[PDB]
Design an enzyme around this catalytic site. Structure first.
Site, PDB file in Angstrom:
ATOM      1  N   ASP A  24       0.831  -1.202   0.000  1.00 56.13           N
ATOM      2  CA  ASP A  24       0.000   0.000   0.000  1.00 56.13           C
ATOM      3  C   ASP A  24       0.868   1.256   0.000  1.00 56.13           C
ATOM      4  OD1 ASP A  24      -1.938   1.896   0.338  1.00 56.13           O
ATOM      5  OD2 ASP A  24      -2.393   1.397   2.429  1.00 56.13           O
ATOM      6  N   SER A  76      -0.751  15.518 -12.134  1.00 66.89           N
ATOM      7  CA  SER A  76      -0.998  15.142 -13.514  1.00 66.89           C
ATOM      8  C   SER A  76      -1.245  16.396 -14.338  1.00 66.89           C
ATOM      9  CB  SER A  76      -2.206  14.202 -13.580  1.00 66.89           C
ATOM     10  OG  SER A  76      -2.609  13.934 -14.915  1.00 66.89           O
TER      11      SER A  76
END
Length: 330
Positions: free
Chosen positions: A35, A199
């Protein structure tokens, strides 16, 4: 040193991925959920409340000659999805894919929430976010990667998750045969303890690319792609009959649909998520309403590039003094 381990979907939907981890001496192999959105290595154990164990493999520290109680240390974690676990702490030898750390903090669960009990395939979590998020008190502990880093050939790990197929976590090297083209690297902020990046935009299907900054985290422990409501609405608007259902808890779509791809930007590069990766199947057995793999982050408070996004790429988690993230197509 290096390590390399195969990671395997837990079910036919890629709801999560498990990776075998050796703990203790002799080794006890547990299948952990790696994770990158958390920083605790915790396991089901001989100390876990019996009624909260249902099929998981447990770690028994009393059977490990290298286990030592970390006296006075406790841990307690609450995840974004409302699940939780807590307990006490041992140090022990932990190996992943041939890479060994001695003295790793292994957090033994005394209590776990229902979602963990109900998932028989996940024996615990191995956190790979920054150690500043580790919950051990009163002395915070380091992640497996942080402990391994100095010994690694290069201070990196990579995630190469499969679509409906196994994939690979590598530590200490970049497998140049595992991706196509070049890796595009992008800046990381560690301010919130995550692999947080920005992004450069998105496209839906064959549509034009929208240049827009989307801050989010690269999180292997989250199944879906959670993005701003504007972006998510633009995606689902291209699927006839798709709608957001408050009763179901997100966007659903007719199972008869063919889903468009979704592209996200990494600098000037582009990662394309095929439409099929966005199908999470019937909302309940036999239903013709299917759950979407792109959902709104509104009310989470952060955008999350979870497995839906990451499995479309070869992803480099560069833990150099100034961390960065790399993405390549594959």
């Amino acid at each position: 040193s290096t390590g390399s381990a195969t990671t395997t979907p837990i079910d036919s939907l890629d709801d999560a991925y498990i990776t075998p981890v050796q703990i203790g001496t002799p080794a006890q192999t547990l299948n952990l959920d790696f994770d990158t959105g958390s920083s605790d290595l915790w396991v089901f154990s001989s100390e876990t409340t019996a009624s909260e164990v249902d099929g998981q493999t447990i770690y028994t520290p009393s059977k490990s000659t290298t286990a030592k109680l970390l006296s006075g240390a406790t841990w307690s974690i609450s995840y974004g999805d409302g699940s939780s676990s807590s307990g006490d702490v041992y140090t022990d030898t932990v190996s992943v894919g041939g890479l060994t750390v001695t003295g790793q903090a292994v957090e033994s669960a005394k209590k776990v929430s229902s979602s963990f009990t109900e998932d028989s395939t996940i024996d615990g979590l191995l956190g790979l976010a920054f150690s500043t998020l580790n919950t051990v008190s009163p002395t915070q502990q380091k992640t497996f990667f942080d402990n391994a880093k100095a010994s690694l050939d290069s201070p990196v790990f990579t995630a190469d998750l499969g679509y409906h197929a196994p994939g690979t976590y590598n530590f200490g090297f970049i497998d140049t045969t595992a991706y196509t083209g070049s890796i595009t690297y992008t800046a990381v902020s560690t301010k919130q303890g995550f692999w947080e990046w920005t992004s450069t935009g998105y496209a839906v299907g064959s549509g034009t690319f929208k240049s827009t900054s989307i801050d989010g985290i690269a999180d292997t422990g989250t199944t879906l792609l959670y993005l701003p409501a504007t972006v998510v609405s633009a995606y689902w608007a291209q699927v006839s009959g798709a709608k957001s259902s408050s009763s179901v808890g997100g966007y659903v779509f007719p199972c008869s649909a063919t889903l468009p791809s979704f592209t996200f930007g990494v600098g000037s590069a582009r990662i394309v998520i095929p439409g099929d990766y966005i199908d999470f199947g019937p909302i309940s057995t036999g239903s013709s309403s299917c759950f979407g793999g792109i959902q709104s982050s509104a009310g989470i408070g952060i955008n999350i590039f979870g497995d839906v996004a990451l499995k479309a790429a070869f992803v480099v988690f560069n833990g150099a003094t100034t961390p960065t993230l790399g993405f390549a197509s594959k």
